[PDB]
Design a binder for this molecule. Structure first.
Ligand SMILES: */C=C/C1=C(C)C(=O)N/C1=C\C1=NC(=C\c2[nH]c(/C=C3\NC(=O)C(C=C)=C3C)c(C)c2CCC(=O)O)/C(CCC(=O)O)=C1C
Ligand SMILES: */C=C/C1=C(C)C(=O)N/C1=C\C1=NC(=C\c2[nH]c(/C=C3\NC(=O)C(C=C)=C3C)c(C)c2CCC(=O)O)/C(CCC(=O)O)=C1C
Ligand SMILES: [Ca+2]
Ligand SMILES: [Ca+2]
Lengths: 480, 480
């Protein structure tokens, strides 16, 4: 039920601006928000063509519409409004918000450069995330700005925070995946910005609900004024945030994380400042992606050093196994190939244990257990006792493993020990008030000792595992 | 209820191919269709990395993935399969279908050119639509190929047909809008091709239903194997079509119409031929768009001739009204300005009727009726008796009108007479079996005399109306 609410078609906006939908062919009015007259100062009925008398920007909007610039922005000094628009099929969606008076563009510009200089010097990611949080905190004026990093399961945890003391500190807390369900996360991957200036706004309808040009209700995916999900607003109330504002951090086409801003009372942010925060997220995205590519490449080539050095040792060795484990350096490398603390090479009934392993009998019983599983190439887990409760007995030495079959009945398995982590959750991760699934009322810190879990296997490490398997597969077939 | 079924996320495919979803980072298997083993000849469990041993194309797919070509196609001669793929966020969606043996590429090429030569010579649209239907009929082998033109209300009517006698002829029939509801039409605007080789296929699931990479169910919007809506399949059964295939005709970013193919028994079409039919639709789209731009421009400049000639006549005239109506030629032009058969100029209580109008009293009572309506610029209708039953009394002379206010209490109204059209519908347009809305069982021709309706006003004509209003607005303000 959770991810099925279509958040992109509510047929309504928030109060802090108004909305006009017009037909590209002729710029005739097709839909409007009920509050449009309160901003524009002219009705514009359905069917009405836009003219320079009522929309002074109409001349530049036509120009914008033919061009390539995906969005339109225009300062309407007359009415102190910021106007913006975008294309949606054959429609232009105009949004009008009150202009943010008393803000400086040199302020933004100067502040943005202080981050861009910082970000381009190759600094530690932690400090990049903090000062990015702290600029958005500076220029936005919220009570809390934080940076929320998604994990592989789409739970996320707070990795940076700036604030004014007025709201709680969530630095280092994990939050469960359902807090930002999948349709929200997909929307946020393509529309990278959102603002909710007042949690208790009364939704302002868009009439007619069905657009007469398309036959459908309006796709509000790129509407910055879109009315948000009712259930999320209970989340905000439950949290005690009267205003929020968030910006997607998109790295390599994927939603990496969020800059999340919250205020204790209501709060608004100008179109300009919101455009500035998107800029900040964009720079940080570039930092993150390069930090990843460089850490990966340097790890891949470091594993390459080890890989070939074992590859030549096995080839040059008489019995071959002695390339993997002939003396100090070969064993050392076998464990460093995949960043392991021990390993078991099993050639039928000949067991060889290197480094810190479980017992010969424990490994026997693991292999039997593995044999029943259907594994294509390699089996990796950071939590062996999840799928094999039995292995809770040797969690200190083999919480995580990579296992590689070799014959039909040999095996090569690496071991990683338990790392004890205390994870702090923003409220109980499992709790939801069932009825429609409603949000939990408490975000008090909820502790959880994490047991039987190793450091996770990096993708270079699994790649080296699969690589090393091939060389071994090709030698036992050759030897026989 | 009708347009809310999310047709793009059924978690299942049709039987005529299989599907594999893999993760772009590593090409690891994330989802598969239950029939994948029946096509690939290797299981590939969830977590399995793709290698050259099981997917020979993996080398070229990696190459494709980095590049700009939005789709991937590859001939897998070994297994007689056509493989294709596309990008979906951070995922590659591979689809495998049996290759169409016994077809010629020179056949397609030669046939496609015979349309392209035809289409580039500026022929009448009717003949372009027919021979486009007839090529798709030729190369696809269905029992009926037709071209379906959407109207402004998203009902559509058949404007070309080629066939083998084995199915009914629908040439000239209208079909109601709900036959292709809005979410289907929006999907077809971006995914321009679809094939349903057998109406009674048993859906083949995609497991796991929730993708572990994204956290969401698979967005199958660009999946050529996607399982179609159950309700549409009742439509096909009700119609007596065992196979179908359709191609969007997209002009200026909008769904203009469909090439719709249907077979009496099951039928399939190769990836190549389907790519060929999309090509044909693409050429025809270009024809249509140029036919429109040229008919419009030539009509706009023809209305310009009249516009300025009246504009100079009004300026040069002493009482001004005599520019609109001083002698033969001025009246002639007043009616030709907007392609009308009569008009009423009303300056307070001074009524002037030109050409074929309703009675002075009828026009009085229309103006009073108009005054109560809230009109920004001009009011146009092709069906005056719809909103003003009273006007059914003078439908022969004023079924359609454009009315333009001028003072506060003058008016300029044009009139168009009733055109009697017998419209043929493919079954009763209003009928749907309520329960979930199910499709009607009869597509027998359903006749409807269309009364009280004029030839519709073209957008150049309304533009000239609004234009002529401005000149008149600016003169009565000047005269006073
Ligand atoms: C299944 C319904 C939902 C439950 C239960 C739930 O807890 N959230 C549910 C739905 C939605 N959440 C949406 C937006 C959203 N959620 C968050 C979450 C956080 N805010 C925080 O401060 C923290 C922790 C630091 C988290 C994890 C955010 C940031 C957002 C985005 C909006 C914002 O900036 O506040 C959401 C979508 C709303 C919409 O866009 O309409 C839904 C449906
Ligand atoms: C509200 C549910 C629907 C009713 C009622 C209904 O009549 N159709 C309903 C839904 C869908 N129709 C879908 C596809 C579709 N419909 C047509 C219609 C025609 N086929 C014809 O031969 C003619 C007339 C000449 C018409 C008007 C077409 C062409 C299609 C496209 C598929 C095809 O090529 O047959 C549809 C979508 C199915 C999907 O893509 O999953 C729905 C949901
Ligand atoms: Ca992460
Ligand atoms: Ca049309």
């Amino acid at each position: 039920s959770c991810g099925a609410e279509p958040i992109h078609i509510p047929g309504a906006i928030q109060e802090h601006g108004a909305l006009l939908v017009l037909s590209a062919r002729e710029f005739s009015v097709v839909q409007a928000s009920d509050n449009l007259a309160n901003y524009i100062g002219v009705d514009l009925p359905i069917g009405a063509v836009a003219t320079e008398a009522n929309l002074p920007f109409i001349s530049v909007l036509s120009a914008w519409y033919s061009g390539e610039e995906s969005n339109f922005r225009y300062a309407w000094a007359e009415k102190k409004l910021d106007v913006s628009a975008h294309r949606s099929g054959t429609l232009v969606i105009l949004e009008v918000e009150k202009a943010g008076v008393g803000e400086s563009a040199e302020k933004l510009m100067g502040e943005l450069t202080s981050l861009a200089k910082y970000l381009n010097s190759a600094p530690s990611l932690e400090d990049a995330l903090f000062r990015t949080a702290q600029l958005v905190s500076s220029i936005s004026g919220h009570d809390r700005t934080l940076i929320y990093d998604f994990g592989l399961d789409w739970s996320g945890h707070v990795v940076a925070e700036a604030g004014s003391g007025a709201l709680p500190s969530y630095l280092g807390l994990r939050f469960p995946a359902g807090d930002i369900p999948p349709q929200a996360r997909q929307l946020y991957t393509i529309n990278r910005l959102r603002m909710i200036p007042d949690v208790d706004y009364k939704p302002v309808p868009i009439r007619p609900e069905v657009n007469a040009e398309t036959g459908a209700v309006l796709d509000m995916s790129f509407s910055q004024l879109r009315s948000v999900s009712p259930v999320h607003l209970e989340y905000m109330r439950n949290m005690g945030t009267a205003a929020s504002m968030s910006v997607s951090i998109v790295v390599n086409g994927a939603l990496w994380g969020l800059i999340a801003c919250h205020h204790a009372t209501p709060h608004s942010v100008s179109l300009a400042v919101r455009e500035a925060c998107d800029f900040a997220a964009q720079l940080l995205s570039m930092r993150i992606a390069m930090e990843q590519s460089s850490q990966d490449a340097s790890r891949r080539v470091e594993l390459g050093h080890i890989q070939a050095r074992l590859l030549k040792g096995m080839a040059a060795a008489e019995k071959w196994v002695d390339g993997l484990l002939g003396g100090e350096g070969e064993r050392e490398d076998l464990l460093k190939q995949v960043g392991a603390d021990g390993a078991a090479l099993v050639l039928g009934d000949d067991y060889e244990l290197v480094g810190n392993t479980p017992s010969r009998e424990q490994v026997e019983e693991l292999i039997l257990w593995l044999g029943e599983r259907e594994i294509a190439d390699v089996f990796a887990t950071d939590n062996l006792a999840g799928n094999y409760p039995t292995a809770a007995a040797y969690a200190s030495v083999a919480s995580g493993i990579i296992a590689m079959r070799v014959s039909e009945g040999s095996w090569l398995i690496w071991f990683r020990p338990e790392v004890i982590k205390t994870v702090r959750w923003g409220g109980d991760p499992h709790k939801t008030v069932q009825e429609r699934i409603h949000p939990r009322k408490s975000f008090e810190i909820w502790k959880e000792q994490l047991r039987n879990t190793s450091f996770p296997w990096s993708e270079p490490e699994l790649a080296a595992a699969r690589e090393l398997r091939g060389a071994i597969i090709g030698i036992v077939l050759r030897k026989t």
